[PDB]
Design an enzyme around this catalytic site. Structure first.
Site, short mmCIF file in Angstrom:
data_model
loop_
_atom_site.label_atom_id
_atom_site.label_comp_id
_atom_site.label_asym_id
_atom_site.label_seq_id
_atom_site.Cartn_x
_atom_site.Cartn_y
_atom_site.Cartn_z
N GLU A 1 0.27 1.79 8.07
CA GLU A 1 0.73 2.56 6.92
C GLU A 1 1.12 3.98 7.33
O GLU A 1 2.11 4.52 6.82
CB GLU A 1 -0.35 2.56 5.84
N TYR B 1 -10.05 3.90 1.51
CA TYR B 1 -10.61 2.66 2.04
C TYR B 1 -12.13 2.61 1.96
O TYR B 1 -12.67 1.53 1.68
CB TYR B 1 -10.13 2.45 3.49
N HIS C 1 0.82 -1.21 0.00
CA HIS C 1 0.00 0.00 0.00
C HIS C 1 0.85 1.26 0.00
O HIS C 1 0.58 2.20 -0.75
CB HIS C 1 -0.92 -0.01 1.21
C1 HEM Z 1 -9.12 -3.88 4.07
C2 HEM Z 1 -8.88 -3.37 2.85
C3 HEM Z 1 -7.78 -3.88 1.91
C4 HEM Z 1 -7.23 -5.11 1.84
C5 HEM Z 1 -7.59 -6.39 2.63
C6 HEM Z 1 -6.22 -5.07 0.80
C7 HEM Z 1 -5.46 -6.14 0.40
C8 HEM Z 1 -4.36 -6.04 -0.42
C9 HEM Z 1 -3.47 -7.12 -0.78
C10 HEM Z 1 -3.56 -8.60 -0.33
C11 HEM Z 1 -2.51 -6.62 -1.57
C12 HEM Z 1 -1.35 -7.41 -2.20
C13 HEM Z 1 -0.20 -7.41 -1.21
C14 HEM Z 1 0.96 -8.18 -1.80
O1 HEM Z 1 0.74 -9.31 -2.29
O2 HEM Z 1 2.09 -7.64 -1.77
C15 HEM Z 1 -2.79 -5.22 -1.75
C16 HEM Z 1 -2.03 -4.36 -2.52
C17 HEM Z 1 -2.55 -3.20 -3.03
N1 HEM Z 1 -3.73 -2.61 -2.66
FE1 HEM Z 1 -4.91 -3.19 -1.16
N2 HEM Z 1 -6.17 -3.80 0.29
C18 HEM Z 1 -7.11 -3.05 0.95
C19 HEM Z 1 -7.38 -1.71 0.71
C20 HEM Z 1 -6.93 -1.07 -0.43
C21 HEM Z 1 -7.44 0.18 -0.93
C22 HEM Z 1 -8.54 1.00 -0.24
C23 HEM Z 1 -6.75 0.50 -2.03
C24 HEM Z 1 -6.91 1.72 -2.97
C25 HEM Z 1 -8.07 2.18 -3.41
C26 HEM Z 1 -5.82 -0.57 -2.28
C27 HEM Z 1 -4.94 -0.59 -3.33
C28 HEM Z 1 -3.89 -1.46 -3.40
C29 HEM Z 1 -2.74 -1.33 -4.27
C30 HEM Z 1 -2.55 -0.17 -5.27
C31 HEM Z 1 -1.94 -2.38 -4.05
C32 HEM Z 1 -0.59 -2.72 -4.71
C33 HEM Z 1 -0.82 -3.78 -5.78
C34 HEM Z 1 0.47 -4.49 -6.14
O3 HEM Z 1 1.57 -4.00 -5.77
O4 HEM Z 1 0.40 -5.55 -6.81
N3 HEM Z 1 -5.94 -1.51 -1.28
N4 HEM Z 1 -3.91 -4.87 -1.03
#
Ligand code: HEM
Length: 139
Positions: free
Chosen positions: A132, A92, A82
């Site tokens: 974060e 979120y 993130h």
């Molecule tokens: C409880 C809420 C959330 C959960 C459970 C979640 C879960 C995750 C997971 C599992 C990953 C991949 C981590 C990894 O494998 O390194 C990730 C990456 C990411 N998430 Fe979330 N996320 C949440 C909220 C958000 C929100 C609100 C946003 C934006 C609107 C967001 C945007 C992203 C981005 C841009 C990435 C990086 C993707 C990448 O590097 O491949 N996430 N998140």
């Protein structure tokens, strides 16, 4: 923390999420990118299989929601990803709206399940945001 009843309801959805999780998260992304198109830039150039990656995290969260220490490493990993893409607290509720709508459309599980997932989402969101915030302060 979440009540035992909320935890019980979350646990009851684990089978549904194992069968339908990627359908849910793919629909979430469709709603997110259409209603809030600026979020597209957060994911551009990131790794493949984002619907699968989120579905696996949701399944793991539901499985261990009563044992969150088991997710220490996974949550730290999410927080770091993130921060690398400048995910902020204001994002979120956008994912929450689209995720709960996708759950309702694909599972139509009833209001008890949707309320439980709203609470569970908010708990994990606050956890991630706090971690974060600290990482955003770190050299
Ligand atoms: C409880 C809420 C959330 C959960 C459970 C979640 C879960 C995750 C997971 C599992 C990953 C991949 C981590 C990894 O494998 O390194 C990730 C990456 C990411 N998430 Fe979330 N996320 C949440 C909220 C958000 C929100 C609100 C946003 C934006 C609107 C967001 C945007 C992203 C981005 C841009 C990435 C990086 C993707 C990448 O590097 O491949 N996430 N998140």
């Amino acid at each position: 923390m979440l009540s035992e009843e909320t935890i019980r309801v979350i646990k009851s959805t684990v089978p549904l999420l194992k069968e339908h999780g990627t359908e849910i998260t793919a629909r979430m992304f469709e709603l997110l990118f259409s209603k809030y198109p600026k979020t597209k830039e957060l994911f551009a150039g990131a790794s493949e299989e984002q619907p699968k990656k989120l579905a696996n995290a949701i399944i793991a969260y539901a499985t261990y929601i009563d044992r969150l220490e088991e997710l220490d490493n996974a949550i730290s990993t999410i927080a770091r990803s993130h921060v690398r893409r400048n995910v902020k607290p204001e994002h979120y509720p956008l994912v929450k709206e689209c995720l709960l709508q996708a759950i309702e459309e694909v599972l139509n599980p009833g209001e008890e399940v949707l309320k439980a997932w709203e609470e569970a989402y908010d708990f994990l969101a606050k956890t991630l945001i706090t971690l974060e915030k600290k990482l955003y302060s770190q050299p």
